[PDB]
Amino acid sequence: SQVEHPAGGYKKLFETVEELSSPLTAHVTGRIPLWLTGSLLRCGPGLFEVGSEPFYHLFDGQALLHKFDFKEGHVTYHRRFIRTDAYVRAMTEKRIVITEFGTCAFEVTDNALVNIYPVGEDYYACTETNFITKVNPETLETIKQVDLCNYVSVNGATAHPHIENDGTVYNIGNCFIAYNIVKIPPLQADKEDPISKSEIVVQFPCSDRFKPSYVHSFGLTPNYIVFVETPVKINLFKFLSSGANYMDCFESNETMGVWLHIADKKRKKYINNKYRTSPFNLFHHINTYEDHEFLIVDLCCWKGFEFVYNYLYLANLRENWEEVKKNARKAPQPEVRRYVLPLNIDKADTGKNLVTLPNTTATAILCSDETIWLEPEVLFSGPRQAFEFPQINYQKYGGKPYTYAYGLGLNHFVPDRLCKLNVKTKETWVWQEPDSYPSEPIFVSHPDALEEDDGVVLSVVVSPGAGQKPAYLLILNAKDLSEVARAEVEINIPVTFHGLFKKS
Amino acid sequence: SQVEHPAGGYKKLFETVEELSSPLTAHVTGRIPLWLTGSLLRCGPGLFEVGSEPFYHLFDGQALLHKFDFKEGHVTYHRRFIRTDAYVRAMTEKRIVITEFGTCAFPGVEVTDNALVNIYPVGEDYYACTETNFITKVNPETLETIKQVDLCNYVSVNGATAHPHIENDGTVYNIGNCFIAYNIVKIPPLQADKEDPISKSEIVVQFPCSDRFKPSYVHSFGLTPNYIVFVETPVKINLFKFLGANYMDCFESNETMGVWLHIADKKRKKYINNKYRTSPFNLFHHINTYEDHEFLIVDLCCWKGFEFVYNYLYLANLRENWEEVKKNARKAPQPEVRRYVLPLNIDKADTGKNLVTLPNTTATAILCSDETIWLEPEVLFSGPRQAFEFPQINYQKYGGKPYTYAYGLGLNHFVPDRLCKLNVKTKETWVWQEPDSYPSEPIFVSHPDALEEDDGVVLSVVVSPGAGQKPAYLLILNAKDLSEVARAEVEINIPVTFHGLFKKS
Ligand SMILES: NCC[C@@H](O)c1cccc(OCC2CCCCC2)c1
Ligand SMILES: NCC[C@@H](O)c1cccc(OCC2CCCCC2)c1
Ligand SMILES: CCCCCCCCCCCCCCCC(=O)O
Ligand SMILES: CCCCCCCCCCCCCCCC(=O)O
Ligand SMILES: [Fe+2]
Ligand SMILES: [Fe+2]
C-alpha cells in the first residue's frame, strides 16, 4: 500500500530549467509502436523565480511548452518558454512584473502554464484567465496573445474546454454574476478566425449574488451541459480592488454544499432542477454521459470545503517526505465519485430515490422543497491517494457510455504512479517505479482500434535517482499498463499539468 | 453478477409452519465440527395468518423459536411457538387480538409482546424480544415459554431494541425511546445474592432528541470499552399519531435533518455535546465500533435516503413474483456499508478543516464555524440493490475493539440469497451462494484453539424449496473463506428468521 519517498526526488518537479534551442534526440529503450506518429504537447511552470524574487505557488512559475515527437520509432524532445506578457516583461525588467496566482508583484496574468488546445487550425496555450496564447505546435514559437474579452462576455475561461468531433469548442467562464458557456465554431470555408465567431450560448445562475464559485472544468454530452457549483468561492469584494494575489480572494462557503446544474445543449436553455449534495472541491470531470432518462456524472472529488490549492504552495511541496505527509493530514480526502442526475422529475415520487437504473448505487432523493439530494457511487478511494488528472479515450467515448479512465496517482499530493480504472467493475491497474514521478497519462488509440482501450498511454516521468537519466517519456500499453517503451533524456523536466497528442 | 429468482422459492420464507412436539434428527452431509457443542437459537415469524385474518407486514407473524443442537457431530432441530399474550389470545379467540407492527386488530392500549426478532441472555436467563417494553423469558433447552416481563416495571423506557450489547462479564446495555429522550439501560451480571438482574436495571445516560415531539426510530447502537454511540436518523415516530392505526402508521421521514450522530462517555455516564452531522440514511444494524487514537470508528449497514425501508417489507410485496419484486425495489433507498470516523478531540484552531488525521481511512470530519462536525464516510461495500445486512462479527473477542472481519446476509432487492464476508480493512469479499437457496443471518462460532479472528465457522439456516430437495437445512461454512463444511438437512419448511445466538454447552 503506502509507498514512501524519503529521498525527496519530487523536488525536481519544482526546479527551474532552461529552454532548448532545438530538439534533442531521446534514447529509446523497448520498442515505440510504428503507428505512433505525432507530437505530445504539454504545459507546465518552468521558471520558479526571477533573479532573487521567488514565485510562491504551484500555479505561478512561468509557462513552459514541451514537445515529444514520435516518428518511425524515434523520439525527440524540445521545449520553449511561452513569450507571454508575464514572461517578456519579467525578462525585460529583471523582476516579477505581473501578479501570479499566488505571488504579488511589487494587469491580469497571461502565464499560460496549464494546457494547450486546438481552435480551428490553431493551437492555444492557456491558464484560466481572459488571455490565451496562440502557439506554433511545430516550432513551439509564441505567435500572439488573444483576449477573449474582445469577443465574449466572460472574465476568464477554464483550461478544460470540451472539443466536439467537428472541432467545435465549448468552455465555461465566470461573468461578473453568472457563469457563461462559450461556443467557438469549427473553421469554415470563409477561413476566418473561429474566435471572431464566439458566442455565449447559455448561462448558469450563481448561488451567491456577489460570490461566484471557482470553476475548473465542466461536463458535456451530445444533449446536455453539466456544471458543478462548489463551495470554493471568489470573494469579489476582495477581487476588484488594491498587495493581493488571486489566492487571497478565495474563501469557502460552509453551508451551501455542492449545487449541480444542467442545461439543454441544443435548445440552449438552463434547466431549473435543483440538484444538491454535500461539500467537495472539484477540479476534473472524468466523463459524462446519458443513460435512459439520467445523466451519469463521473468526478474526481476532494471531500471537504477547504480549498485544496491551499496545500500547493511550493514551500510545502518542496518539504521533505515526512513533512509532506504531515502537512496533508487535515487536507480534503480525494475520491472518485459517480453521481446520477435524473432528468424526468415526477412529484408523485416525492420522498423517494429517483435513480431507477439497474447498475448503480447512486441515489437522488426528491424533497418537498423540490431540491434533489444526491448520493454518489464511490468508484475509487484510497487514503490521501488521489486518482487525478483523469483521461479517457476522448475522441470516441467523450460524452458517451464508457468503461475506462486513466489517471495520475497522487500520494499526499506527490505524483508517484499511473492508474487505470474500470468505472463499471472498479478494477484498477497501476504502474509505479521507486523514485519516479510521472505526469498525467494521455491515451492514444491504435488508429484502427474497435475496442475502447486498444492503444497506449504516454506520460512524462521525472527520475532524479543519482544513477539515472533525469527524465523520460514513458509508453504503456493501455490494456494493462505494462511498459512498451521509454525515451530517455539527459536533462530535468519540471512538472506539467495538461496537454494533448497531435497526430501527424 | 445479477442472480435471478424466477421460480419464486423465497415465498416459502413467509409461509406458515407448524411447531414440533419434540426435536427431529437432521441428516448430515459433510462433517459437523466435533468442537461445536451447544445450541443455535433463532427467532422469526412462524404464523402469518389467524384463520382467515391475514397479518400484513414482515414484522407481524407470530414468534417462533428455533433450535439446532450440535453434539458429537450430530444435529437435531426443534421449534415452538412462543406463548406470548399475542399468540395465546389469538389461539383462544381464533382471531387477531393484539395490534402488530403493520396489522391492526379489530375488536388501555395493548402493546404487542410478539417476540419474533431476537433472543439474548440476562444473568442465567434467556429472553426473546421484539422492540417494545415486553420481553419473554424462555427455556433455551425445551423452548418453553416461562414469563412475560414488562421493562416498564423496572426502568423509564417505552421500549428497548432487539440488539442489546453484552459485555464479557454479562452486563447488558440497551437503548430505548423515553416519551422525549433516548435512555441507555444497564443490567448487571448475576450477583452472589442470586436475585434477578432485571430488578437491578438502571438508566445510566440519556441522549437528547432532535425534535421535542418526534423521537427517531432506533434499532441498534454502538458500544466500545469507553463510549456509547447512538445514530439519530430521519425516520421519526409521530407521537401525535402514536398516543384503526398500527405502528407503521405512526412513522414519517424528516426531510431536512440528515443524520445526527451522538457519543456518550460510558464510564463517566455523560453525554458528550459534539454535534456530528451527515447526510440522510436509514440504519438498522451497527456492525462494530472501536477506538483508534483520538477517534471512534463507526461501521454501519446504511440505506441511502430518508424514506423508511420498512415500507418495502409488506408480505404482499415480498411474496410477489421476481420481476415484480425487482421493480418494487427500484426507488427504495440503496444499501451501503459505511465507515464513519468521529473525532473525540475538537480543536477550534482547525475550524474549516478535516479532523480525521488517521493514516488508514478516507473518512472525513469537517469542523464548521457553528461547531457542527460534518462527516463523510469511507464506503466499504456497495452493490446495486445488493445489501450486506444482518452483520455479525467474532463478537466475544472483537466486539467494541479493532477488528478486520464481518459476516453478513446478502439481500437481492430485499430477498436473502447469499452469505458474505467482508474484510473491513482491504474491502475484499467472499460469497457463498446456491441457486434457489435463501439463507439467514450467519452467526460466528470460534474454534476453541483459535489464533486468528476468523478461525471458526458461521452457521446459517437455509430454505431450499426446489422440488427435488430437502426443504431446509442448517449450513456450516468455514469462516476463513466461506467454503462449505457441512449441512444438516430437515424435511420440513423453515420460515424466515431475523436474529439469534449460539449457546455453547
Ligand atoms: N490551474 C490552476 C489555476 C491557474 O490556472 C490560475 C493562475 C492564475 C490566475 C488564475 O485565475 C483564476 C481566475 C481567473 C478569472 C476568473 C476567476 C478565476 C488561475
Ligand atoms: N424489528 C422490526 C420492528 C419490530 O420489532 C416491531 C414490532 C412491533 C412493534 C414495534 O414497535 C417499535 C416501537 C416500540 C415502542 C417504542 C418505539 C419503537 C416494533
Ligand atoms: C502533477 C501535479 C502534482 C502537484 C499538484 C497535485 C495536486 C493536484 C490537486 C488537484 C488538481 C489541481 C489542478 C491542477 C490542474 C490544472 O491546473 O488544470
Ligand atoms: C432475512 C430477512 C429477509 C426479508 C427482509 C429483508 C429486509 C431487511 C432490511 C434491513 C434490516 C431490517 C431490520 C430487520 C432486523 C430486525 O428486525 O431486527
Ligand atoms: Fe486541470
Ligand atoms: Fe435487527
Swiss-Prot record, chain A:
Palmitoylation by LRAT regulates ligand binding specificity; the palmitoylated form (membrane form) specifically binds all-trans-retinyl-palmitate, while the soluble unpalmitoylated form binds all-trans-retinol (vitamin A). Retinal pigment epithelium specific. GO terms for biological process: detection of light stimulus involved in visual perception; retina homeostasis; retinal metabolic process; zeaxanthin biosynthetic process. Pfam families: RPE65. It is a lipid-anchor. It catalyses: an all-trans-retinyl ester + H2O = 11-cis-retinol + a fatty acid + H(+); lutein = (3R,3'S)-zeaxanthin; all-trans-retinyl hexadecanoate + H2O = 11-cis-retinol + hexadecanoate + H(+). Keywords: Acetylation, Cell membrane, Cytoplasm, Endoplasmic reticulum, Hydrolase, Iron, Isomerase, Lipid metabolism, Lipoprotein, Membrane, Metal-binding, Microsome, Palmitate, Phosphoprotein, Sensory transduction, Vision. Its EC number is 3.1.1.64, 5.3.3.22. The modification Phosphothreonine is found at T99, T103. InterPro entries: Carotenoid_Oase. Its cofactor is Fe(2+). GO terms for cellular component: endoplasmic reticulum membrane; membrane; nucleus; plasma membrane. Its main location: cytoplasm. Critical isomerohydrolase in the retinoid cycle involved in regeneration of 11-cis-retinal, the chromophore of rod and cone opsins. Catalyzes the cleavage and isomerization of all-trans-retinyl fatty acid esters to 11-cis-retinol which is further oxidized by 11-cis retinol dehydrogenase to 11-cis-retinal for use as visual chromophore. Essential for the production of 11-cis retinal for both rod and cone photoreceptors. Also capable of catalyzing the isomerization of lutein to meso-zeaxanthin an eye-specific carotenoid. This is Retinoid isomerohydrolase. It comes from Bos taurus (Bovine). The gene is RPE65.
